[PDB]
Design a protein around this ligand. Sequence first.
Ligand SMILES: NC(=O)c1ccc[n+]([C@@H]2O[C@H](COP(=O)([O-])OP(=O)(O)OC[C@H]3O[C@@H](n4cnc5c(N)ncnc54)[C@H](O)[C@@H]3O)[C@@H](O)[C@H]2O)c1
Ligand SMILES: NC(=O)c1ccc[n+]([C@@H]2O[C@H](COP(=O)([O-])OP(=O)(O)OC[C@H]3O[C@@H](n4cnc5c(N)ncnc54)[C@H](O)[C@@H]3O)[C@@H](O)[C@H]2O)c1
Ligand SMILES: NC(=O)c1ccc[n+]([C@@H]2O[C@H](COP(=O)([O-])OP(=O)(O)OC[C@H]3O[C@@H](n4cnc5c(N)ncnc54)[C@H](O)[C@@H]3O)[C@@H](O)[C@H]2O)c1
Ligand SMILES: NC(=O)c1ccc[n+]([C@@H]2O[C@H](COP(=O)([O-])OP(=O)(O)OC[C@H]3O[C@@H](n4cnc5c(N)ncnc54)[C@H](O)[C@@H]3O)[C@@H](O)[C@H]2O)c1
Ligand SMILES: CC(=O)/N=c1/[nH]c2ccccc2s1
Ligand SMILES: CC(=O)/N=c1/[nH]c2ccccc2s1
Ligand SMILES: CC(=O)/N=c1/[nH]c2ccccc2s1
Ligand SMILES: CC(=O)/N=c1/[nH]c2ccccc2s1
Lengths: 256, 249, 260, 258
Amino acid sequence: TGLLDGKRILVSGIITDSSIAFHIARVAQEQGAQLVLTGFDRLRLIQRITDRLPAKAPLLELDVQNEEHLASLAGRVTEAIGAGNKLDGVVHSIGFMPQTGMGNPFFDAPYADVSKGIHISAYSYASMAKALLPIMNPGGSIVGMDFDPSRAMPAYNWMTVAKSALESVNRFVAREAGKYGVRSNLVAAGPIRTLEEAGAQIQLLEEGWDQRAPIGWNMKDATPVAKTVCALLSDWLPATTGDIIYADGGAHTQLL
Amino acid sequence: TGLLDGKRILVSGIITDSSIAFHIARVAQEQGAQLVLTGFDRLRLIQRITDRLPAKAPLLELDVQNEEHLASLAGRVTEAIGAGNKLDGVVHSIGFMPQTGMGINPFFDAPYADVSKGIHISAYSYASMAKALLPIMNPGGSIVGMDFDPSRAMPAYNWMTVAKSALESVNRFVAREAGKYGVRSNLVAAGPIRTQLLEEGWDQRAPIGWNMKDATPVAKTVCALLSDWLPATTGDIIYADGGAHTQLL
Amino acid sequence: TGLLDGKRILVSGIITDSSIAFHIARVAQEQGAQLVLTGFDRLRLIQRITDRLPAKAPLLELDVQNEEHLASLAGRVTEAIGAGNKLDGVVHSIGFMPQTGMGINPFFDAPYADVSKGIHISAYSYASMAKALLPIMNPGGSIVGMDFDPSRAMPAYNWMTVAKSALESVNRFVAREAGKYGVRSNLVAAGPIRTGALGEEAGAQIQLLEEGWDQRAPIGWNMKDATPVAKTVCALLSDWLPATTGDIIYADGGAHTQLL
Amino acid sequence: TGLLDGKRILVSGIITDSSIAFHIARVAQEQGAQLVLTGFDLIQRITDRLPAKAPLLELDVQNEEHLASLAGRVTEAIGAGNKLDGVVHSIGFMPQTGMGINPFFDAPYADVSKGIHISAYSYASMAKALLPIMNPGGSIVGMDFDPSRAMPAYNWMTVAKSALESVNRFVAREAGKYGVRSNLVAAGPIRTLGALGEEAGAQIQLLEEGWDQRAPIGWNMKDATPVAKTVCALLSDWLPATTGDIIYADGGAHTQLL
Ligand SMILES: NC(=O)c1ccc[n+]([C@@H]2O[C@H](COP(=O)([O-])OP(=O)(O)OC[C@H]3O[C@@H](n4cnc5c(N)ncnc54)[C@H](O)[C@@H]3O)[C@@H](O)[C@H]2O)c1
Ligand SMILES: NC(=O)c1ccc[n+]([C@@H]2O[C@H](COP(=O)([O-])OP(=O)(O)OC[C@H]3O[C@@H](n4cnc5c(N)ncnc54)[C@H](O)[C@@H]3O)[C@@H](O)[C@H]2O)c1
Ligand SMILES: NC(=O)c1ccc[n+]([C@@H]2O[C@H](COP(=O)([O-])OP(=O)(O)OC[C@H]3O[C@@H](n4cnc5c(N)ncnc54)[C@H](O)[C@@H]3O)[C@@H](O)[C@H]2O)c1
Ligand SMILES: NC(=O)c1ccc[n+]([C@@H]2O[C@H](COP(=O)([O-])OP(=O)(O)OC[C@H]3O[C@@H](n4cnc5c(N)ncnc54)[C@H](O)[C@@H]3O)[C@@H](O)[C@H]2O)c1
Ligand SMILES: CC(=O)/N=c1/[nH]c2ccccc2s1
Ligand SMILES: CC(=O)/N=c1/[nH]c2ccccc2s1
Ligand SMILES: CC(=O)/N=c1/[nH]c2ccccc2s1
Ligand SMILES: CC(=O)/N=c1/[nH]c2ccccc2s1
């Protein structure tokens, strides 16, 4: 008798057992969900990782920059879950920014690199919704992973810019998803350890988080973020869409 | 299994069966919560409303402007739930602004005495209730208040909107205090509920629609925050408004 | 040849020559404005202070909790600036919270009577002053209030933060009313301005809060100096921000736009 | 004795005399500024209508060579030994696939990427090129329209503005090292130069009429001067402690729900 009993949910973005999506998938299965997983590039390695999840689930290839993968996705999912069945949830846990746009001077990042990062990190949220909405049930939920980009910070640079774009994309996706009786929301997480001046500033930034968070923040524990995503995939936030839920220990609500 | 199974939760704010608190109480009981209810002024009237709930629940008097009521509250709750038990949740569903501060009356014509009463009941009392109840709350617990988005001005709601702006600020400070107990504090910002142009704009703006006759989605959202499923959220606002606030038109 | 040449502007909130309002008044006068000043309670002291401004200006008594002061204000201003003349600007630089609601006292230990007084003076009075003065303001005019960013909680500032959240909301409603007169209403959110007394623990918290500002501000923040804030207020009083109302302008070195 | 007296200011984004940049340039010259203009497309014919002569430099923000040579070309135009006190970014672009009647989901990424390059990334590109020739106390200003909420039609241009707002906050960090401010002006809709059809035309007219209705001081979409003046305020010394920020020149519309 789980929070997600009988729900069919697609989860993208597992690459390691530290991946936020791995914990999302773990909690979702513990709560009764039937999953379809998608992975990028390193499929044999990803299969080895997903073997560590509590239940078996099909793994499909999805490169969000690959138009052919996106064109075939719905059919591939339907084959996996069975004709006449549809998805109740979709989790987007995908991000990438080349090193030039992260860690290197903000100004030295070439647009080619920034563009690739925006494609994967922001545009693909719309891509995946476009592909999947036709196979989603009413009452369904699309959830994307965010971090709060309302203020600039050292190091994350163009990735922050990409999250700013993602939040805007989410609001437009919500308009489209509404036509299908589907919600679209983002979870804005605090820092999670999922793997020199960049490192020093990130350190201060991460140390700041636990001190600002009124309930604390454990950057080694993805479970609170995973549980938040499962809340959004459930029937218990039925009037929330186009929105951002902060799973960050309350840090963004506190100056110090 | 219920979402709130075994949880002891205090719910304020029931005055009618259209009250948002009534629907919160109903859904919470359906999900296995054991409730303590608080009401203001018309306690016999409120008792008859609470008879409509699926399960029996003790009713305690609480006028949030009454310091003696606040002083005795934890002790009266402990009597209601049993010595050695604590609360897992507190729901603040309390608000009031005199007619001089809402409606047809010009914004400028509300006397400060009326505004101050409104702010006392609608904003400061979120802090008062947390002060009274945190000493009898369990770690992992949750305080939830009812809000509406006050980030932009609108016709009519005038000083009540100002009171909600205050309440949002108050919630952020309550989160700091509640955190010391391992307790979360959050507000649910609801769309309009019948408990007109402004109101019908809502369903138009909301990507998933908005039914102002239906409090259940708001009640479910409150229960989500009372549950263990949003453990990293505090000092925050969850919008149960059909997404209306994310859309311009 | 000043930014505010010919403008008649009322400036409230001077108590010392470190008051933000003192610097607003100074800059405004340097820029050709003709001022009327309002002061609370210690008018003799305030007269000695306003003797240090670049020009002589009339001083009117205004306790914003005194309804009779508010009822008579427009009349008294009109006497000060001449029959047939109206104001082009109004500066609200008034705030107050008792020590029970701001400082070392725990957030939960502020009684409502104290919080209510603070909200009266710090937030409600922005509406009060707008109500009293809009009938004697020219089209194109400007009402500016002082704010600090209350969107996140912080140590010490406690109920004054709550009062500022209320003020920001009040400002948006004042903008609706002021618009009828062709008048703008805006707030300037300033960084902290110096205008062991709280002990070492709270003293340390506040110093870290203050120093964090200068570190976050991309252009730095000088907490000794109200001039940049005074200039920002004068920008809002001028004709150069003519399509901005109900709004907040941050004069904080950009601190609020940066996380670390 | 003007607001920008003696200031040397680069203004990009003039294509017609209804361009917001044309109005910014006009007001800036009226206020005593010495301009250098940049354009990319007959533009000299348009810039000839400004009240004073200004050198006009080619700058395609997608062209890396134009960016790499920009500072040197500006220095030659303003004279060795002189630096810029201001820079205005008034540049935006989104293909019709990403903005207008085309469904949100039907914009290919190549089109969206081009739009984000020109509309968002180029704010950083220009700052990079020009900061080394800016005076302390200088000001960089870019044009925005409030993207905090989704709206019909504007679609991926809204996304590009959301990205621009984030870029501005990062440019502020870099610019501060030079004692330079970086801010955006978020304008309400301006009637620059039934093309979209009956249905989407009516949606847009509702979107525009609601703006004047929400604005407590009203909103005249035919008049860019209030926006031009706001830009000049930011270029002036009168907002010396504002950076990484957004100033709304929208009649107050964004502060009101109805
Ligand atoms: N770790 C954090 O601190 C943190 C905080 C907030 C938000 N997030 C967000 O959570 C999400 C997951 O990050 P994570 O921390 O688990 O890192 P991760 O590296 O485990 O996951 C990122 C995933 O993106 C996938 N990906 C990259 N390019 C792709 C492509 N072209 N097609 C399909 N998939 C692609 C990767 O394969 C990987 O599985 C990201 O959106 C990230 O920005 C992370
Ligand atoms: N109805 C809506 O459209 C709507 C939308 C968003 C938020 N809210 C909020 O939800 C909450 C509940 O409102 P509702 O719409 O259910 O209306 P309601 O009238 O049913 O509830 C208001 C409650 O506040 C209580 N109250 C008033 N003064 C009190 C005092 N001194 N001490 C203790 N309790 C007192 C009343 O007795 C009543 O039970 C309020 O905060 C309201 O602002 C309502
Ligand atoms: N100092 C800062 O760091 C800072 C930062 C941001 C905003 N502000 C705001 O700027 C404004 C001015 O504060 P300040 O720092 O110049 O302090 P201040 O003490 O110099 O000025 C506050 C003024 O409020 C007046 N006042 C108090 N009660 C009053 C009443 N009943 N009627 C009329 N006037 C009354 C006082 O007499 C005083 O002149 C306040 O709103 C304050 O919150 C200050
Ligand atoms: N309603 C409005 O018109 C409105 C409202 C708010 C903000 N804005 C913003 O104001 C700015 C100016 O827009 P406008 O309405 O004056 O339109 P406009 O078409 O006159 O100006 C757009 C400019 O961008 C320039 N441009 C396009 N691609 C370029 C490239 N590769 N390199 C260099 N320049 C390039 C064009 O030449 C043109 O001068 C834009 O950023 C726009 O988004 C416009
Ligand atoms: C060069 C590189 O690995 N860049 C990354 N960018 C992101 C962004 C989000 C999550 C993981 C990653 S890994
Ligand atoms: C005069 C009056 O009934 N005022 C109210 N104010 C509120 C505020 C919130 C909920 C119910 C109410 S009833
Ligand atoms: C007890 C006390 O002096 N409180 C204050 N509160 C404020 C608030 C704003 C400006 C000055 C002050 S002095
Ligand atoms: C005309 C067109 O296809 N695209 C444009 N996009 C923008 C965006 C901003 C300003 C002008 C324009 S013209």
